[PDB]
């Protein structure tokens, strides 16, 4: 907790100079067990005044829970939903009169964006705190426009991956967290590496997973390729050439003359490399999910998952599965549910309070729902799964920092068992192209880390 | 780079209703109307010169293009005004 005591030493300092800061603390530690600490440091004597917290739907819940467990009594309230939010607005506390009962205002990015009018009226907010800074990495996003209408006399940004894509996301954030850094001229950084470290030493504060305490044994991220099977090769060529919509149209049970999905070959070849059923399910209606239930073994990457999982049940340590889409997680669930495994799943389609209890059950150690399906953006940010021990990323791309945030989900203060990561992939395929692109993006990331 | 009839329609409107203004959608509607009418009259004049054997489009067959393209009471005024201009153009 020492680091977290240096985390509260530096946000009490920021409060002093009248500065704004980007808490880029390492993901998987501190942050919130450090945000509420600063918030009690001021709620004591300094009160709360207009205090507003905005965060992703999944975290809002975890935050309320943490408040209920770390702080003895912080008047707080979760302003979630619409129309039902109108009643709690006043059964909250006086309109603008801020007393020892004025409850902490916790909202979401949608609510904040859709009805800023309501909160626009409130006094200069003592401290607006935005949980996931990456949300504002675009300088034309409508949330940013609506976020300026608020009269804010102080700002704060929490994150763990400040830059992911390029430097312009650093540029857009700065202007926001600190408009004293307007610099709306492409920036002057572009030797210079040191010059950038002069501007950024004052605010950015990052730690590291190694820190000092052993706690979490080192993790291992390892890539285990698979060999594309014959049928997938047949599908791939019939696309590299053409007439796939027709050779497969030979069946085409539904949507006769199914639209040639000949767009962005990369994508219609990645979907193949994920599982060929995705293509077959559309060209031919096939109301029936693969009835043989061993046609799933035609996918090479599926067969490597299966064997991995049989060897990881040999020990039973709970696994984690990630994917880019939700059709593919669905195929997986079908497959395993036929064998009989009990699965829990939280994608974006599932509701909020529904997914919160699923975790509260998955977190129940006695219950044997070991498997846990989870889509990237779905619930790869803000969820503690110390119960699980192994993360399998079926597929992820276009932004490497997307994946990391997931791995940490399992690997976070309190995870005693050492963590592995199994980035599956298919050798000599479109997947490797993406893998190399990701490596390129990381290359940039490591030049950024050398900067650090 | 893109030429239209915006200036001239605006000046005509200020000449008719000194205080009314016009939005952009209505301005586009009015531009399209003028283009449509120009194309109609010009194509009819060309074809009508082609019926006779003449390679020249004079003013007196802008007359009859107008009398074929415009209906009744609308043409009898337009024709008149046309003659007006031409007289004031030449005996100037």
């Amino acid at each position: 907790k020492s680091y977290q005591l240096k985390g509260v030493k530096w946000l009490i300092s920021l409060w002093q100079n009248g500065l704004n800061g980007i808490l880029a603390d390492q993901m998987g530690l501190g942050k919130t067990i450090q945000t509420i600490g600063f918030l009690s440091h001021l709620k004591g004597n300094g009160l709360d005044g207009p205090y507003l917290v905005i965060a992703p739907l999944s975290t809002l819940s975890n935050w309320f829970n943490e408040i209920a467990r770390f702080t003895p009594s912080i008047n707080a309230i979760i302003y979630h939903g619409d129309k039902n939010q109108r009643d709690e607005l006043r059964r909250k506390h006086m309109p603008k009169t801020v007393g020892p009962k004025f409850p902490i205002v916790i909202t979401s990015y949608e609510v904040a964006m859709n009805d800023a009018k309501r909160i626009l009226r409130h006094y200069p907010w003592k401290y607006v705190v935005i949980d996931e800074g990456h949300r504002l990495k675009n300088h034309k996003c409508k949330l940013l426009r609506e976020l300026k209408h608020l009269k804010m006399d102080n700002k704060l940004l929490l994150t763990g991956t400040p830059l992911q894509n390029n430097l312009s996301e650093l540029w857009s954030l700065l202007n926001f967290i600190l408009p004293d850094i307007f610099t709306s001229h492409d920036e002057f950084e572009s030797q210079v590496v040191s010059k950038l470290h002069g501007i950024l030493r004052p605010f950015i504060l990052r730690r590291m997973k190694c820190d000092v305490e052993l706690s979490l044994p080192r993790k291992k991220e390892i890539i285990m390729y698979a060999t594309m099977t014959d049928h997938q090769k047949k599908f791939q060529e019939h696309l590299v050439n053409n007439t796939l919509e027709a050779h497969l149209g030979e069946n085409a049970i539904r949507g006769q003359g199914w639209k040639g999905k000949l767009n962005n070959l990369v994508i219609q070849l990645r979907k193949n490399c994920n599982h060929p059923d995705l293509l077959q399910g559309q060209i031919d209606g096939s109301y029936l999910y693969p009835p043989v239930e061993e046609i799933v073994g035609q996918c090479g990457k599926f067969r490597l998952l299966e064997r991995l999982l049989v060897r990881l049940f040999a020990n039973n340590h709970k696994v984690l599965i990630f994917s880019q889409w939700t059709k593919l997680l669905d195929i997986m669930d079908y497959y395993f549910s036929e064998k009989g495994f009990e699965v829990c799943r939280i994608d974006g389609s599932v509701k909020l309070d529904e997914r919160r209890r699923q975790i509260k059950d998955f977190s129940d150690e006695k219950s044997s729902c070991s498997i846990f399906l989870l889509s990237t953006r779905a619930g790869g940010l803000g969820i503690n799964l110390t119960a699980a021990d192994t993360c399998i990323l079926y597929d992820s791309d276009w932004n490497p920092q997307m994946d990391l945030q997931a791995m940490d989900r399992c690997h976070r203060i309190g995870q005693t068992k050492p963590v592995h990561v199994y980035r599956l992939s298919t050798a000599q395929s479109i997947e490797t192209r993406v893998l190399k692109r990701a490596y390129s993006k990381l290359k940039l990331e490591h030049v950024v880390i050398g900067q650090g | 780079s893109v030429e239209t009839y915006k200036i001239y329609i605006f000046k005509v409107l200020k000449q008719v209703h000194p205080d009314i203004g016009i939005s952009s959608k209505a301005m586009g509607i009015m531009n399209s109307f003028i283009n449509d009418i120009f194309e109609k009259l010009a194509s009819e004049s060309s074809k009508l010169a082609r019926y006779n054997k003449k390679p020249t489009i004079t003013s007196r067959e802008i007359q009859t293009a107008v009398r074929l393209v415009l209906p009744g009471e609308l043409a009898k005024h337009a024709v008149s005004e046309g003659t007006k201009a031409v007289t004031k153009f030449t005996s100037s």
């Binding site: - | 001239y8 005509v12 209505a26 509607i29 010009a42 415009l70 201009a85 153009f89």
Partner: protein, 99 residues
């Protein structure tokens, strides 16, 4: 040029358009003048009706609805613009043989 004629439209641009579209081989001198006068006349008769329809609605700026109403009231213009649909102009209100 087109100040000697009392017109408000460009005779020179009209002549450029007429000679560009290759409607004939030779274009006379009174042809752009005649065609430019009969266009400002039609513009002036549509705009007056549209402004009148604007005045009734207690408005000071014409909108597409006003052009629609002005065209659909008058008989001559409705006969000329019989197959045109003024993008977003509504319809002429009408009820038949019932309360």
């Amino acid at each position: 040029r087109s100040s000697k004629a009392g017109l408000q439209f460009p005779v020179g641009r009209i002549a450029r358009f007429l000679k560009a579209g290759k409607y004939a081989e030779r274009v006379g001198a009174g042809a752009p003048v005649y065609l430019a006068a009969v266009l400002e006349y039609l513009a002036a008769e549509v705009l007056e009706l549209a402004g009148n329809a604007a005045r009734d609605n207690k408005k000071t700026r014409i909108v597409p609805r006003h052009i629609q109403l002005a065209v659909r009231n008058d008989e001559e213009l409705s006969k000329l613009l019989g197959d045109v649909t003024i993008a977003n102009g509504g319809v002429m209100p009408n009820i038949h043989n019932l309360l």
